[PDB]
A paper describes a structure:
Addressing the elusive specificity of cysteine cathepsins, which in contrast to caspases and trypsin-like proteases lack strict specificity determining P1 pocket, calls for innovative approaches. Hence, we set out to determine the crystal structures of cathepsin complexes with representative peptides of cleaved substrates. As a working model, cathepsin V was chosen because of the resolution of diffracting crystals (up to 1.3 Å) and crystal packing with accessible active site cleft. Reactive site mutants C25A and C25S of cathepsin V were used in structural studies.
The MPD molecules were bound to the primed site region. The peptide LLKVAL was cleaved and bound to non-primed sites only when co-crystallized, whereas soaking yielded binding in the primed binding area. Of these, 26 bound to the active site in a substrate-like manner and several of them with a different binding geometry in each molecule in the asymmetric unit. Peptides from patterns I and IV bound to cathepsin V consistent with the observed protein cleavage sites, whereas the peptides from patterns II and III did not bind according to their cleavage site found in proteins.
Numbering used by the authors:
A (entry chain AA): 1 to 222
B (entry chain PA): 444 to 447
The structure:
């Protein structure tokens, strides 16, 4: 069976928290976060990947740069493009810019992606436990989320269907002694280390797909 | 979503 808790940050799969700043690019940070963990599982090397490469170059796949996008369209771009540049070689500037993808600087590849069954939190738990960090979308449009600081996030006004923010599930756990009580998903955001809990948020788990965390989850195939 |  699956572990009572998982935290891929403790195993070297997760880069330090990044900051998308004033650009609608959380989808790009969610996608690079999932590819960073899959490339680490494959090679043992953790290398920060370029969100800007995704913002500037994946319009053909249907993304809109700083005006929004989807993680699956990003994994589709990496596959069609044959690669993705490192954060070091293609730095983030938080504005739409000319595509400058360089194949010689590519440090990652994927053959497409796997989708988690929509709305199934236990399928998501199995993906997190057996694959690594998973890209997910959520409803983050609330002041309670903007000002989140600690504890299990639970917002009554949250939607499980109309999502507006891409994030990365890096694990799951529970508070207390009963592994089934006060469960939560461990989620990496892209609003900087300063937001929330060192840039992370615990979102309530197995509470009817709260905030839609299991509605549109996926991970790249490397 | 952007942080405010
Ligand atoms: Cl965004």
């Amino acid at each position: 069976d699956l572990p009572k808790s998982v935290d891929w940050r403790k195993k070297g799969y997760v880069t330090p928290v990044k900051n998308q700043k004033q650009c609608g690019s959380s989808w790009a940070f969610s996608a690079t976060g999932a590819l960073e963990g899959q490339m680490f599982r494959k090679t043992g090397k953790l290398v920060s990947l370029s969100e800007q490469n995704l913002v500037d170059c994946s319009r053909p796949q249907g993304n809109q740069g700083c005006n929004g996008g989807f993680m699956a369209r990003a994994f589709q771009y990496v596959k069609e493009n044959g690669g993705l540049d490192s954060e070091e070689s293609y730095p983030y500037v938080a504005v739409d810019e000319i595509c400058k993808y360089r194949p010689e600087n590519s440090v990652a590849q994927d053959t497409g992606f796997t989708v988690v069954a929509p709305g199934k939190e236990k399928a998501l738990m199995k993906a997190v436990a057996t694959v690594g960090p998973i890209s997910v979308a959520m409803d983050a449009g609330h002041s309670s989320f903007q000002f989140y600081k600690s504890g299990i996030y639970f917002e009554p006004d949250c939607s499980s269907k109309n999502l507006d923010h891409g994030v990365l599930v890096v694990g799951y756990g529970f508070e207390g002694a009963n592994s089934q009580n006060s469960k939560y998903w461990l989620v990496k955001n892209s609003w900087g280390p300063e937001w929330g809990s060192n840039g992370y948020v615990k979102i309530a788990k197995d509470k009817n797909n709260h905030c839609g965390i299991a509605t549109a989850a996926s991970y790249p195939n490397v | 979503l952007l942080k405010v």
